[PDB]
Amino acid sequence: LNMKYRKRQLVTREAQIKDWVENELEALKLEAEEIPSEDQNEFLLERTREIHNEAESQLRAAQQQWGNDFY
Amino acid sequence: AQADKQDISSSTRVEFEKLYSDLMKFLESSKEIDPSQTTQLAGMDVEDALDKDSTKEVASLPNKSTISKTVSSTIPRETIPFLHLRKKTPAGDWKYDRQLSSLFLDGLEKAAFNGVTFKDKYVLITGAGKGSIGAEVLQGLLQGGAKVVVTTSRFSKQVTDYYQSIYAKYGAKGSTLIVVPFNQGSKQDVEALIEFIYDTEKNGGLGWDLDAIIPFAAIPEQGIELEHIDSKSEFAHRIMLTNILRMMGCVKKQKSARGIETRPAQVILPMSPNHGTFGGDGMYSESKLSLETLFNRWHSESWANQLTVCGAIIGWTRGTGLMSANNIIAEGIEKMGVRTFSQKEMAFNLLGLLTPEVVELCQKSPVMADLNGGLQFVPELKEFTAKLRKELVETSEVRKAVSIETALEHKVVNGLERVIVVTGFAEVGPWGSARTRWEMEAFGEFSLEGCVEMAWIMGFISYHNGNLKGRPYTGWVDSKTKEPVDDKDVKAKYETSILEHSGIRLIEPELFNGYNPEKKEMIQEVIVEEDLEPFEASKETAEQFKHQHGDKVDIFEIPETGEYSVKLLKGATLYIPKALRFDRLVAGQIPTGWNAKTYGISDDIISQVDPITLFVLVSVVEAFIASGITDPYEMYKYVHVSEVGNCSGSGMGGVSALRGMFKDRFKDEPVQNDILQESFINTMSAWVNMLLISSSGPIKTPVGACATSVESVDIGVETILSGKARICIVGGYDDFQEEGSFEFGNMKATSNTLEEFEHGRTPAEMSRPATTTRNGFMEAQGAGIQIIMQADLALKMGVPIYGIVAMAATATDKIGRSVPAPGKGILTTAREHHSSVKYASPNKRDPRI
């Protein structure tokens, strides 16, 4: 596998973690307001800026392997 | 791959060469083919402001040496050949018997085109190297494939590298190259010389048979007429004939001891046709005539099947370094009586006088040969030789006389995020900064902007001489040698030869006189006791007497009370002093150094921390300017919790005052009590912590000794592979102490002189890997540091960066009964582990790689 591959880096992760960015946007989009419209941005800036961390956690975790820990 | 234009052409010649390699692969032992466009003579009397030129033309009708046979073939006027092979004329002298001479012509004609190998000839050389003929006779015999061994009158470093180039430049597939110094005179030695070259390998070595011999002489002996049979020229008259006569007999006496007497040995003899002929020669002429007794002696004296005499008349060759009078004319000689051969490659013909179809004919008979290019056809050589120069020296001079008076006439009238990189590196080794030695690994020269760095260290320059107030008026240059020689000492043209070798030949051996602190090494203070019975009653100062009383009890040395004084002294049979003894130590003098260590560094820390700790302290600043980042406080503007930091400094020694604690304490030398903090191996990093950049984060400090300082990289890179720490800094230094040596070499590892002296004196060498003369490696004091960064803060406000981290050590997984045992599979075989379960196809754990 030792060639600088990037394909399975792009195929399984970098698509599935890119699957639920919009589906993780959808994971908020069941609670669209539901009594926000007074607490909307607190519902925005808490969940959205913490699900970005999970994607960012999953970003380096996918890039743990595929080169940084390819072996 | 074709991106470079040259590379295609490189590839073009490559396969061209590769085929030429492949065709000649496993063939004979190559050639003798000196395919260089041979010149002749180029004398040029310059008209105006210059005199005689020099030489080296291009020679008309030549180019290829194939022509150079043919040109040398059909000589001029009433001639057979320019170089001929005569015969002992059955009644008379050396008449050009063209019959046998044809073959030598043919053998020379056999040359050039066909390669001329000489494999397994067993040859030996008296004459010099770089100066004259024998080096050419050496070189073709290397590419002839011959097993060759050589002497030298001198012996030096300057000659040792000289041949060492040539075996790396001309030694063919099967040639063998070994040198040895040898005085030709003082004839006792040649018995040991003839021993060693026929000795078995259970003796000194070189189990050879020695089937060719060239004894080329020395000692110019100029300007002496008949009535002076004076000193060492007389001794020179021995060494042209006597010892070489005494040489060849014991060859046979060695050979016929074994009795391999149907395999003879060649001797080629430098003859001279010009005896009673030149001027202030002295003994040189009739000494050369002495060689000709062998022709009668080869018949009728029972050694003929062993020694193969084939002399060489050769002379009047340019390429003057020595023995060659008249590096001048060469041309009127080839004009008045046009006869040839003022060249340099006569020895090419002499190589042809060591080939088969010739030496077999020399097995039949000795061969007198007039190789000299018709020079004997000149009536009155010598005065006409003078006559050419005396016309030429005036016409050069009188034209040089013309212009100066013209000038006399003329002058009067007129007026990521875990892969980690190294960012600043700096070592203080034996030499200067790491930037200095990077040239010293590259060249021998010190690159004057870099050479003054060697002078900025060692206190040699005196930079910051005052911008104002130089030598009496204003003006300033970075001075040198505090106040004798402050005259302007420039980083341009100066500093060569006024800061050189005296400034350079202090960093390699004799290890010092008076540095560590003294450590003479010619005498080592080794101490023995005694218990005789004299009794002394010396004088003391009080309170020493009680530890006198406590040490040796009251049945000895009742002190006394020394009234109106302190106390009194020795009593009984004393059982002490451990006085001293003059003892000789062999092993020593590998490193040296720097002769000065105070940069701009704060004093009075150098009262306390001292011995090795300066070197790491300068090093980390040296790495920080290598990082280009001074002010280490200004890292925390990348604001952290500051929990990251410190190095992992390492080293077995550092003893350096523990000998003060052990030898000098209990012998009472005044050393500070606070040395116990300075005893340990981590306290170096503590002043890298405290009186330097001062975060109290992670510190590891392994040992790794006898192969150290690589290990702290790995534990350091683990700390940044961990999230426990960002930016870190490495281990480093070895160090050298007097208790280190002798307790070095008692474990028989490092090196040992005298057998480093006695083999080849060469004290700057001291390191012979893999050309089979190893003695261990070396030891140096040394100090070295590299720093490393998070690759992101290394990017963000770029430090800058060097390279790429590589490896990971420490899985020993081994036991035996030895220390030290070298690196076998005990290390670096878990490195490139690669267990190989059945794959047959490619593409943390990874059982593949």
UniProtKB/Swiss-Prot annotation, chain A:
**PTM summary:** 4'-phosphopantetheine is transferred from CoA to a specific serine of the Acyl carrier domain by the C-terminal PPT domain. This modification is essential for activity because fatty acids are bound in thioester linkage to the sulfhydryl of the prosthetic group.
Task: Please list which residues make up the signal peptide.
Answer: none
Physiological role: Fatty acid synthetase catalyzes the formation of long-chain fatty acids from acetyl-CoA, malonyl-CoA and NADPH. The alpha subunit contains domains for: acyl carrier protein, 3-oxoacyl-[acyl-carrier-protein] reductase, and 3-oxoacyl-[acyl-carrier-protein] synthase. This subunit coordinates the binding of the six beta subunits to the enzyme complex.
Q: What else is known?
A: Present with 17000 molecules/cell in log phase SD medium.
Family, as annotated: Belongs to the thiolase-like superfamily. Fungal fatty acid synthetase subunit alpha family.
User: Subunit info?
Assistant: [Alpha(6)beta(6)] hexamers of two multifunctional subunits (alpha and beta).
Q: What's the protein called, per UniProt? A: Fatty acid synthase subunit alpha
- Which gene is this protein's source? FAS2
